[model samples]
Target: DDYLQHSIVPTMHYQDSLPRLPIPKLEDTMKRYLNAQKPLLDDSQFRRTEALCKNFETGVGKELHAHLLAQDKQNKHTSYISGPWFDMYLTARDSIVLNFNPFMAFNPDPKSEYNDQLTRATNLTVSAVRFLKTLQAGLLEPEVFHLNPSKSDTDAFKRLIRFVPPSLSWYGAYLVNAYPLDMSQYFRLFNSTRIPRPNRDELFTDTKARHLLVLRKGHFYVFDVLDQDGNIVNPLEIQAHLKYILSDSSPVPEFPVAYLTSENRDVWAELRQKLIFDGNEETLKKVDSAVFCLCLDDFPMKDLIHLSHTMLHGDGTNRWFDKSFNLIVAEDGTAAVHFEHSWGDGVAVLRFFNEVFRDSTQTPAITPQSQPAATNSSASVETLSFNLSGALKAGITAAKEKFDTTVKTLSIDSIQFQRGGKEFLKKKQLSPDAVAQLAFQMAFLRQYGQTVATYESCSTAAFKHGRTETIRPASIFTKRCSEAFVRDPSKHSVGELQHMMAECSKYHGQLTKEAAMGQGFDRHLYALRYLATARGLNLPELYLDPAYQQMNHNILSTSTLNSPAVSLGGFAPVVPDGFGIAYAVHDDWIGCNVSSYSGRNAREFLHCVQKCLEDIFDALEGKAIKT
Candidate 1:
């Protein structure tokens, strides 16, 4: 009975509620658009427009896009930027069901007339495009929007695109009573209409294709429709998919390897590989042309989990992409293999992998298939532990210090934020997307170019790698003394930093400007190095003395397990905007990569470096260190 109520009934509600909206036909949306003065539509009209706006090309669909784009801008960046090819999907869905738009037009009283539908959706298409440029710089292309000209999904493409590789749908955590929890399981979901074997003519004549659909940015919407012959499908006919609530139930998914192994790994792997190459381009184009047109769809954020899931993608340096773990025994038995070096950080990838393998199962809308029947709910609850005390203490201490000092002076004279004999600004006015992109680009450049700057700068010196450590103090002091050069201020100059942030909106400008000027990038760099020193050796205290000779060794020891560890591994972009990875792991290491964003990679790197320091601090929190 409870299972029916928790998982079963919700499907009924979702279905029942659909008929309540004032869904208009394409003709009606066209009428409303033609007769507009201010040109913005209401909650219902906006929804209708979204419905009708699908299927139009980015260029020809300008009128529809103009409406949606304006609607998005007015919506205070809450509107979802459905693809240029979405209307075709509406046609395929029979204009029946729709994906819920996260950041839904939250009208407290549906019956009330106060719902202002004049807001705009955050149109980050250009921003998303710009962000991609940074990735291209590294010779890496994003996997989301490539086209698959081959009617069939081939294998080679999947291995290159997917970190864990796809084709493991069943092996992955699934929603039984309902959707899977842990939030990470939902990503890049789509709807397809062609089923019942190859039937190419039927699929072609049917005019339905695959297209990405989501309840929120990074989360998916999986629908289960039963056909007349007792067949289950994505666009369900009789029954609907179930829902999982994070607030009501703690759905920490426990993915048992034993259960996962039961599935056909080879077939799954092949399918994933095929899909990876053929999936997006073909699926999306098909969805655009035929498949998604059969029903009604709306990606509503009725549930908070969707919002959090999307937020998660943005938490760390990675920005838009996140390589989540779904533990599956690959047909090839590749084991826990490492990604290509530049793919992402190993630690972050492993952490996500480890989480997927954990036994904790989130509460399911339907009771878990493998679980024993009739268990006590209260006893099954679980809590996560990761320096709870230390986090709290650090948060409180930071707060107190902020309140007490107002602001403290930074060591501006000693450090440099730029490289390559060039200077860059201390600040810039940028959109969130722009800032993230900039941060990542800068960090990538720094990371790749670091070898040149190492103490091994000279050929003779390079070969004498370990010799410096054994040399007399006189030689060390000389090296330390010469370590200074005004580091061309052009690449990351203080002026540039100030200028950039100045161009940003009032809020961002106000928050970052003072800090940049007061502490300066030079000082911030120094602080990061100090943190690196402390974490490298796992020292009891932070060693900030400029006279320190073992700087490279001290930092390098932790470098292997430093910033990259916390950022790529522990970074969760979905957290609150202001919170970041560096803040999360400051006490553990000496470096802080959580500097201002040049782009995604740079910001992530900076965030991880800072987090490394935090980890050290967290480790040593309660222990009294001898002065």
Candidate 2:
């Protein structure tokens, strides 16, 4: 019966036989590691790093290698590394906030009418509900190569549907299987919700709840999206409820609860305790028991970039980031999703949005059975009220100040380069994604005159319950090519520049492929290091090595998602000094959302990226490759 259930999902059918992540030979990795640091280090520094590499090769690394090998023999999974990787992921961070959360801003469906805000909002919500119905019916196919569906992992597809709970304990956090495929009646997933407090936050769930909370004009309301018979409510009913709520348009107590979610996790945790102790716990529970929140933003965004910014961390008044996911719809018909990062990676959410957009925007089949039945007995939207104490109000005031200050310090540069995108690169026989990645490497090189550590997330869903592995986009070939282009672009011939670009693209492609197969270097190294510490083994000198620290301190955190459907993607820099580059390469244009802290010149870096793209295009088109 279990096997029968597995067969339902084509992606998860081959769960046991996929290749395991292998432990690379120490000698090979040592050489690669030292080479990666050469472009960053000077003569004396290189010498010291070289020595450290040698020390690691002969010292504690040998024992660590042996232990990993033994563990590999005993382990059933392809990689013994996944266990340690999971442990580190759960406990490595204090809180999941801007540094960890990833967001995407979706353009309104082309087929939907956006002339009225309520119409557009109801349309988007209805589309999402329809997509959810597909998932519940087990009709949603697992993600696969559109070109080659046979290669996809069916097992990992199931894991993607499992949702992560917000709460964390000393024992560590784990994802709960929210949707089990066997039952005709799927588990009620939309139950969980997040409420902000002064310190820590609280998440509440009601398994039987069928309503979603709506945050509009600094107020909260609950509206049932499902009928008593478990059928999805008609979109007209939702629109009516929204119109009814807007009819009052009255002044209410301004409880700036959303701002607290933007504060640091530790600070929020303490504040959460205080809020519960001071305020009404039952009110908080009611807020939490709702499936999820739909933030009906008041202001209109002019474009996708502004929509991206608003969705990522809204106007502070309208967003509640503690929920598993927030479906945000702006007054001007702009829509986006801002979700908690702990559940899974962007791939899952991206898949969800992709399906929703695909279903909603397409002309519907006018079948009698397919059309939703209309009913006069529509559920009314209920507003959740709070009795704000003086202390709670004061706490909200202080949190608002802190959050505004922090948001102001962060800078954003949205680049919509109209040339040399995926279509242009593909015509020249290059990987579109790799070309975008090289553009960043070259841009950073030109900006700061050296290659720094970079982190590009690669999906590791081929393995059972896998998430991601770090694909170090910086390579020896990339460094050499960028240095050549930046130092004297005129000195290199068209052929020479083309060669360099080819090497750069090839290296990136190889790393991406390996990481997807769970053979990436970063996770393997992380596994070895974490396992030794867990076993009470002495801290290895290799980890203590300055070169090791320098190599892993991500200075440029970037990721590429070539979603033609999704126009805007953004993420925060892992380090304060670094830049976070989230880009999408389209056929005729490339879009990037760059973020950095106060002192960092993210705008200049983005400018460099634009120039590099043009330079690459020119060189490929017979012009000199000079930056």
Candidate 3:
């Protein structure tokens, strides 16, 4: 009865047998650590960091690194960074709204007819349920990255991979260049919620629940997506419920409970208790256990920037930001997923996004002509009611006011760098990612006149229970080359600049590979530091160094994921003056969706990025560099 009976490959086949994430050597960690700091520090500060690094490597870090390894060995079931990484996220007291949540927007359906709000929402939910069941049935195809599927993804490969013991299988997959990613985070995608608590939040899940939560006009509604038979309810009935909810004239509440989810974790945690005290515990539980949250918005398509704003954080009236992922459908049928980051990364969300998009397009459960199964839609749908006291009402007001004020200071913009893209970079024998990242470095140096810390994220999911690793893109190679391009390209010969570009790519290319392989210094050092504190040792001077603090600031927080189903992705600045850049290098064009708070101008940054790409492309093609 399960779908995996004949599926391509069992989902758990990879997760059960994935290799452990390795800890980099202590010397390599410190060496890479110092290199990342040089471009961010002056000579005086750099020397101070060197002293700290030397002290750490020879003095305390030797013991701490050994302890980290010992502790990792003691607990071989998970990665060393897993606990500390999750703690790093949950312990931060900021509002998860802009601080810990991110969004990825879906491209319009190919049929376009299915792009209507009611139709799209219904189909998306049905597709999600199908995906959910396939995954729960353990038959979902394992997510694997094939360097060449023609050779690595053959039946021969699967036959050997599935039968090899879990501990010894990665080598076989690696030799074939068919990388299987960790699927441990996939189970949290449904029926999971990030429960707010004082100081630190917690994740909750209930696999038995099958209802879907819908938020509209500050009201909550719920309906079961599955029948008593544990199968998806008839598509027409699901569509009918959505149609009914969309048409219902529910007036805006005096206090939108949705806004409470946007408040600071500590504040929201306290208010959550108040709601439960007012006899709303069961309602809250239902909200938490629903398969997922769906927000039915009343607006139509705006520009991409406008849509970015909506998807990132709406008026705080129609979003439960704590849900594992929110399936938001605009009145014009635009869809995007806004998810909490503490549970998982974009690797899990992007795969779900692509699957849902592909399924809804190719084998949708319903169509434009489908009629509602002749039933009383209202009978299955009931609006959730809450008893809010004076304190709760004031809390809601406070959260909404803060959300509005915060969002007002934010700016967003996107650019389609059309002069060149992946295709053009390939022709130049360059890495598209490196060229794009270099252009980001070039743009900042061109505009700001100095190099600061920057971050580019790459997944480490090839290892079990892996997340993301920090790809620090600012380095001496980028710094000097950026200086050449910004402070006067004429100062450097065309040939010299070309050579610098090559060096940038060569270094960044390797960093990219190392990061994906879970060999980056950031997470390894992070575990060492965590181990030191967990064992109650004095703070290492290396951890106390100012350069360490500066490098962690991440003024340019960037990430890229290529998918045809995704229109774009975004997040707020990690720091007030920073930029959150989500990008893709397309066949003929490059796209970047950027957001920023006060002090940094998102639109201007994007413009500078485009200019940098154009300049790099011209230089690579042996043309005069634009001043």
Candidate 4:
């Protein structure tokens, strides 16, 4: 029955075996890249550091003190590693005050021979190892099995498994172990910045290991465990256990001293399936616009024939998104993508698609090709140009508007979602069946993409740098009519940030001192409303199998049963509460993915996410559309 879905959407995806990029430490990479044409770091290195911090803080919208404190606390654990630190740094870099340092003091006469940076780098590697182990352990949670069974084919199939977030620190080993370490000794690398102009494509293809992604404080670190050609003999391939400190003051369950069992073929196989294709027709059609997919369908293996090059050289309406995926598709049609933050994230996108795909069709009515649909070639480019120009203008205006203050001053807010969160968490224990039922319900509504959903992302940046363009007054506007009372704190008093936001909703134009000084309830209300909208969507349930429940004399449990005959990853028998599908797209890579679930009353769940998105977008645009 499922195979027929393939005919409706004849799409293909391809992977380039050689497209992985060489990612090194940010600072090191920068230093090397800057060495060629001009000097970058100045003798007044402190001033440079301050500028870096300030620009990042004001532009990104983060608080440095908060990050520094969090990092200090995290590092106290022996199990803490580079992934966490790097992720935390990203969070810090996003804040205004934390991004820049008006008061920062750089280490003068900093020892070039210092073992400090190297030692820290070493810790980061260890952290990646530890994090991977912890993730694998979580994956073993009984809920994963109770939900997804290998053979119980149903509309609710994808609901059977759960995905974990990726990490950030260990991405560099692919290069070092690929070639003899000595061969690449002369070049230097850095993170977040370019350096030494090392051929990124070459280094990634040459790695001796597979890479893993780590996440902390909302950023990612990639870990490498293999070299190019998947060499089993590489020294870096040897098993090594990590010591991660979770905390210094409190006791932690002892870190597992034994080496984590290497992931079995099935583990990587599943990930590979997801990354490549689970042989799903829907997925294939969704990615057809990817040039690499076409190349994979055609030229798959050799480096000599390039897919991305063809896209770059070819004329297409969406030249960028289409061509961007070129290197990932090799001669044989295997398509894999190793991404940077600029492309957002791969795993997040995967999860998003996995969630969205259950209900979306393998093929929709829209054209899958990247080219324009013009009857005449002469008018094609002009028509596309005109449309795209409008889209670009709208995007720029929207981006700037997104950064503006959302609400007027003097508004009171409600704390609905916090209450919702508490209520939802309580259902895990009290209404496990109900949760599963909801997930099934929500899955379908997402398939149509008509349901509204809400999404909000916040970033902080430094003040003195370009961030001045984005920051809205943290204060609120007051109705006192006096400009001084509008935003200036001296004129108004608010107890909390939410109070200030509530007060800021009614104002227009650049924020005034009086506007910044008022209460912020409008902001809080908006945030809470958005959260409430999201949480209201039902997620797939963590179910217990029927036999196990009977044996344990428990109707619901999130853990696995030790019984050998009872397969893990099967759902427990329960009366249907509701059923439907939920839709989501991976924020990373804009992977056009979909997912579905089925249970009694599940339609509401599906309807909710769709509704949430539509509602939020409409609200933001100040327009009302028929529900």
lDDT of each: 0.22, 0.67, 0.88, 0.21
**lDDT value, residue 35 of candidate 4:** 24
lDDT of 4 by residue, 309-375 (tens): 2222211111111111221222232232212221222222232222212211221111112222222
Model 1 misplacement above 4 A: 1-58, 63-441, 449-487, 490-497, 504-627
Give the range of the ten consecutive residues with the poorest summed lDDT in model 2.
166-175
Model 4 spans with C-alpha error above 4 angstroms: 1-627
Error of 4 at 368 (Å): 20
Tens digits of per-residue lDDT, candidate 1, 1-627, equal: 111011111111111111111112334333322222012233564454444334322322333334443443554312121211122222221101001111111112122221111000101111111222222232222111113324212334333223322333212112111111111111111121222112110122221222112122112222212223322222111111211111133232221111111112232233323433543334323322321111111223323223223222211111111111111111111112112111122333333333222211121111112222343323322121212233333433443343223112100000112221101122222333222222222233334322111111100111101001110111111121111101222343334333433332233333233221221111222222333343463321212222122222211111112222222211222111211222211222122222111222433455433332222122223222111
Q: Report residue 410 deviation for candidate 3 (angstroms).
A: 0.6
Residue 259 CA displacement from its true place in model 3, Å: 0.2
Cα lDDT of model 3 by residue, 1-627, tens digit: 312124555677767667789899999998999989989898999999998899889989998988888888998889999999999989878989888799999999888788888889998988888889889876677888899999987887887777777666767788888889998899899999999898689999999998999999989999999777788888889988999999998689889999998888899999999999999999999899999999999989788988999999988999999999999999999999999999989999998998889888878778887887877877899789998999999999999899999999988899998887889888888889998889999999877877988899999998889999988889899998998888878887779998999899899998889998887899988888888888888888898888888888889999998999999989998998899988999999999988899899877788899889888988998998877
Q: Rank the candidates by lDDT, best first.
A: 3, 2, 1, 4
**Whose TM-score is higher: candidate 2's or candidate 4's?**
2
Best by TM-score: 3
Models 1 onward score TM values of: 0.20, 0.83, 0.98, 0.19
The residue pairs found clashing in candidate 3 are none
Clashing pairs counted in every model: 143, 16, 0, 173
- What tens digits encode model 2's per-residue C-alpha lDDT throughout 355-430? 6566545532212123233433234666776666777677778878876776777777788889757778898888
* Cα deviation of 334, candidate 3, in Å: 0.4
Clashes of 1: 143
